[PDB]
């Protein structure tokens, strides 16, 4: 029930897959990978 890495999402309401530590970015409005 989440978006994969690189999937376009919202920075304020990020809903990426937390299992792989994925967060939404505000510059490209997609799922970015931290580290």
Matching residue, tokens 């530590």: 21
List the beta bridge partners of residue 24.
31
Q: State whether the Cα torsion 6-22-35-26 is positive or negative.
A: positive
Experimental method: NMR
Spatial separation of the C-alpha atoms in residues 34 and 2, rounded to whole Å: 17
Beta-carbon contacts of residue 6 (< 8 Å; ≥ 6 apart): 30, 31
C-alpha of 9 from chain center: 6
H-type alpha helices, 1-35: none
């Amino acid at each position: 029930e989440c978006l994969g890495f690189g999937k376009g999402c919202n920075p304020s309401n990020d809903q990426c897959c937390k299992s792989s530590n994925l967060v939404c970015s505000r510059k490209h409005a997609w799922c970015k990978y931290e580290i």
